[PDB]
Amino acid sequence: MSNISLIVGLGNPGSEYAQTRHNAGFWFVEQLADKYGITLKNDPKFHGISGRGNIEGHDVRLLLPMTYMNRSGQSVVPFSKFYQIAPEAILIAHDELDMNPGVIRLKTGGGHGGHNGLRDIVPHIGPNFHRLRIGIGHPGSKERVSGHVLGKAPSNEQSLMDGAIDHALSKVKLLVQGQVPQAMNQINAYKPA
Amino acid sequence: MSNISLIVGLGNPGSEYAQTRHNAGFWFVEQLADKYGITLKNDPKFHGISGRGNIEGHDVRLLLPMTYMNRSGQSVVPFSKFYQIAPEAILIAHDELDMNPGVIRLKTGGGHGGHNGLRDIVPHIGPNFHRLRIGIGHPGSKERVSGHVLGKAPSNEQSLMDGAIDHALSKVKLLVQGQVPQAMNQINAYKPA
């Protein structure tokens, strides 16, 4: 329904990618799973890692595609179809070039904005899912983007992103209770202390 | 039996990885394919891009896994099984952290040496295939490895690697004509300085 029932984290599998900026979505959903004591388990049928449990009085599914970023739809699409989860009840957390470290915003609908993980999802389920856009900064040219997203942020930038993620984690109650405009106001207002 | 009939290049799919050090094996096989006018085509059955043609009077197959590096066995294994090509007839080109840019060596057997592409192949076909080890240099600590292999080499290092690949290319006649010891002597003698 209006309630967010499925929270997806985008990123790449394996310890060599775990700390890279392109894994911002993974950071959010891994931290959310442990905050609520939801176990993320290997889910090879849906080419991901997935979990289910109570978040703030609602039964919520958590998914990390293990397809690699540009093939995320190979996990998200059959998973959401098998469980008959409408896009409107999906939140996809991802790295956002177009926002700085320590900026974080909740968006509903629109396109992929050149994000190759969203590019593999929008065609299949349509655009009407929610996104948690975790700012990672833009390095200032197209050519520098790959090294940036596949790079580890320096600690001052990582702390800015970690603070924005912590803030967003504290608003998931509004999202799973279906209070999306209140979640949007409260997430988007975030500024580093 | 001693003739190389299958040449594999290891690497990651997509333009964002094409110039990264981890794609050294792709560089070698792409350059080999165009040297001999061998078209590399989509081969979804074997989760790769593949070609076939005449190299120096021999029918040789070329394979670029499109699995991502750590899943290269998902292509190499079923491909080698389907064409019934034994390990001793396989040459796998890959990036080598433990050799400097401009160093290039042909090796027969042994293990993966922590290369996560070889790690996904050795368990299934065993160790008795040949390897073209393309030096890419070592960034000097385990934590720096991922940024190094998923990074684009500076022009000076790229020139060294390119000259080594060019030299290896000059020796493929010996490999496909079943003169492996001669190819190993002549490849491993390459001096980038």
Side-chain angles (χ1 to χ4, degrees):
Chain A
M1 55 156 329
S2 274
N3 289 349
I4 297 301
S5 75
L6 168 56
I7 303 179
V8 181
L10 297 192
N12 283 305
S15 66
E16 65 260 46
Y17 288 97
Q19 304 175 55
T20 67
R21 296 180 180 92
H22 220 25
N23 270 43
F26 272 34
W27 310 327
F28 177 72
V29 172
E30 282 170 355
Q31 293 172 35
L32 175 66
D34 200 43
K35 176 180 173 60
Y36 288 96
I38 297 169
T39 305
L40 294 177
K41 309 190 216 301
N42 192 43
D43 196 354
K45 180 179 162 107
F46 298 115
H47 310 290
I49 282 171
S50 75
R52 189 195 44 74
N54 186 307
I55 299 179
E56 297 290 353
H58 298 265
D59 212 66
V60 187
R61 299 189 184 273
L62 303 185
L63 177 66
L64 306 179
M66 291 293 143
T67 54
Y68 291 84
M69 179 68 85
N70 295 5
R71 295 174 186 181
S72 296
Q74 292 176 29
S75 181
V76 173
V77 179
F79 185 101
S80 65
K81 288 187 155 88
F82 182 79
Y83 291 114
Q84 291 202 329
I85 305 176
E88 292 82 2
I90 306 176
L91 174 68
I92 305 190
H94 62 89
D95 59 304
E96 185 49 73
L97 286 157
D98 293 349
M99 296 164 193
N100 283 319
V103 180
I104 187 158
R105 294 185 191 143
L106 180 78
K107 172 193 176 57
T108 299
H112 51 61
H115 193 282
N116 292 323
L118 296 180
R119 190 196 299 280
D120 198 57
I121 297 165
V122 174
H124 309 297
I125 62 167
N128 299 321
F129 55 90
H130 310 280
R131 311 94 180 275
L132 183 71
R133 305 178 68 185
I134 307 167
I136 62 159
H138 196 290
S141 58
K142 270 159 201 135
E143 314 87 60
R144 279 206 288 271
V145 163
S146 176
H148 184 75
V149 307
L150 298 186
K152 176 188 202 311
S155 64
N156 67 306
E157 284 178 36
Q158 192 65 51
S159 303
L160 288 175
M161 298 189 289
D162 294 349
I165 284 163
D166 288 346
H167 178 75
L169 287 170
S170 78
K171 304 305 170 183
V172 163
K173 187 179 162 54
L174 291 166
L175 288 172
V176 302
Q177 277 163 23
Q179 289 183 57
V180 178
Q182 303 100 295
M184 186 170 299
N185 284 327
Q186 291 184 32
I187 290 162
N188 286 17
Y190 181 71
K191 296 185 63 196
Chain B
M1 301 267 91
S2 149
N3 299 47
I4 303 303
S5 66
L6 168 61
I7 304 173
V8 180
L10 298 191
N12 283 307
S15 65
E16 68 282 24
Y17 288 97
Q19 299 166 68
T20 72
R21 294 184 182 89
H22 221 23
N23 269 44
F26 276 25
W27 307 334
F28 174 72
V29 175
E30 288 170 345
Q31 288 174 40
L32 179 62
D34 201 54
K35 181 177 159 73
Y36 288 97
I38 294 177
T39 298
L40 294 173
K41 313 193 209 289
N42 243 87
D43 198 347
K45 180 159 145 63
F46 299 115
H47 307 292
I49 282 164
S50 75
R52 180 201 185 181
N54 178 4
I55 303 178
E56 303 292 353
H58 294 269
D59 187 43
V60 183
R61 292 177 180 280
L62 306 180
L63 176 67
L64 302 183
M66 290 294 128
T67 54
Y68 290 86
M69 180 66 90
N70 294 6
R71 294 168 189 184
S72 294
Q74 302 188 19
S75 177
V76 175
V77 183
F79 189 103
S80 70
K81 281 190 189 173
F82 177 81
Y83 294 108
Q84 290 169 31
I85 297 153
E88 299 69 22
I90 301 181
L91 170 68
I92 302 191
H94 67 89
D95 57 308
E96 183 51 73
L97 282 159
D98 291 341
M99 295 169 188
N100 276 307
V103 176
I104 190 156
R105 298 263 184 286
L106 182 75
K107 173 185 173 53
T108 300
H112 51 65
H115 191 282
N116 297 324
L118 295 178
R119 193 195 296 277
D120 204 50
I121 298 167
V122 173
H124 309 289
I125 64 165
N128 299 321
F129 55 92
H130 312 283
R131 308 90 180 278
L132 188 67
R133 305 178 70 182
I134 305 162
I136 63 153
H138 197 299
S141 79
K142 270 146 264 54
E143 313 83 79
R144 286 192 287 237
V145 165
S146 165
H148 185 78
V149 305
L150 298 190
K152 170 180 172 51
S155 71
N156 64 304
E157 292 178 18
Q158 190 71 54
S159 293
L160 287 176
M161 289 186 296
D162 295 353
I165 287 166
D166 283 356
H167 176 80
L169 289 166
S170 79
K171 302 315 181 178
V172 168
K173 175 181 181 48
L174 287 170
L175 288 161
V176 301
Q177 300 198 327
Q179 243 102 62
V180 169
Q182 271 207 95
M184 187 172 291
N185 171 53
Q186 289 190 33
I187 292 170
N188 298 357
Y190 183 69
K191 292 171 262 314

